[PDB]
Amino acid sequence: KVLPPILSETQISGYTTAATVAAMFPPWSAAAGVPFSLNVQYRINGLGVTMDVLNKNQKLIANAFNKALLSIQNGFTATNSALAKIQSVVNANAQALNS
Amino acid sequence: LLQQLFNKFGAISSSLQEILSRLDPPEAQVQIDRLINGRLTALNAYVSQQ
């Protein structure tokens, strides 16, 4: 038989929800103290980018941010390597138990 | 691992002295080989765990 784990998967859903919302609203803990796009500007600043253009191209940066997130979302189509790595786990377990 | 020296493994006794003092020598090897196979299987399982 296969026993269920000790925590639900909805509990780990709640834990990733808390760790995602910890970096969006006060007191901005997973954003490390400061607000979110403030922290993004300081991160791009530390690579060699002037704070002038980060203050000047802010909505373009946030649009590209949304676009990257959406293309991540719309890409689980039959050749995603992450889905292959998830399906390998299930196929390996099923083959070992049937054998 | 020490408790495997008192299993019979299909033989008539787990003591080697009782097998070597109650059977003919061609009739004893068949019972000794079962003890040998069981003890070696136990040692291989232990070594894998380590």
């Binding site: 103290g33 400061v34 403030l38 500007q41 704070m51 002038d52 203050n55 802010q58 | -």
Partner: protein, 79 residues
Amino acid sequence: FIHFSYKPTSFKTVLVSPGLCLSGDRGIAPKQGYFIKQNDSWMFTGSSYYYPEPISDKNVVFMNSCSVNFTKAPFIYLN
């Protein structure tokens, strides 16, 4: 291993700003702290302890522009 850690024991609710847009289209942001308002003066506090202090150039990082949601401070050319 023995691990020693910082640990608060009392809190206070304050209102903070994360940055100021200064006269001449400049900007300042705090370092490891927040811009607060004490007695109608812009001050700086550290983020692990409440202690307001003068806004020097050791508590800020300067920018020759400013972000669109900074707080307005024309009276601040201070130390």
